[PDB]
Structure 1
């Protein structure tokens, strides 16, 4: 028997066109450029899902360095003292303390100073 290709192609192409909503110009209207746009966006998402962790760690390091230079300490010396004192708090929590609990951050910095000497 004959199998004419109805109802199956449009359903498959419309999903790809719908996935490209918000793209400039005809990238959200035409199947052929929408397909390439969707593929490229998936690849970009896959790569940036790795780059995001590095970006946030760099932000935390910069913030901790800024907060620790006010205690007459580098980021390098402070991290060495914290490792040498036995404290195991990651950069995320240290940046949080630096931003909105500066007294506790100063306490931790004092402990790190004690450990160094």
Structure 2
């Protein structure tokens, strides 16, 4: 028996165009172009789930290095000082304590000074 394939096409195109919804020019409107944009977007989305973790880790270290040199220590010594006193606090939090509770960040720099 014959199968008209008109209902199903638009179903699977509309799925894709709805993902491209937002893109500039044809990349939004036109299926052929959108399909590529949607896939490349996926590739990048996958690729940057990895880079998200790196970028933030740089960004924290920068904050900590800045915050330490206010108190008079370079990051490399500050981390080695913390690790030598078996301190387990990660970068993410150190970058938060750097910004927020500077009285608490000061005491970490003393805690690290011992070693």
Q: TM-score normalised to the size of structure 2?
A: 0.96
1:6, distance to aligned residue in structure 2 (A): 2.9
After TM superposition, list the pairs within 5 Å mapping 1:66-77 onto structure 2: 66-77=66-77
Q: CA RMSD in A?
A: 0.9
CA distance, structure 2, for counterparts of residue 19 and residue 79 of structure 1: 44
Aligned: 1:108 with 2:69: no
Unaligned stretches of 5+ in structure 1? Answer: none
How does 1:13-28 map onto structure 2 within 5 Å?
Answer: 13-28=13-28
Q: How does 1:1-117 map to 2 (within 5 A)?
A: 1-114=1-114, 116=115
Tell me the TM-score normalized by structure 1: 0.94
Could you give the per-residue CA deviations for residues 40-77 of structure 1, whole angstroms, max 9, x where no partner exists? 00000000010000000000000000110122211011
The SS at the match of 2:7 is coil
Q: Helix, strand or coil: the match of 1:8?
A: helix
* Structure 1 Cα separation of the partners of residues 6 and 23 of structure 2: 28
Q: How many residues align?
A: 115
Query: What displacement does 1:91 show?
Result: 0.6
Deviation at 1:26, TM superposition (A): 1.2
Moved over 3 A (4+): none
* 5+ long unaligned stretches in structure 2: none
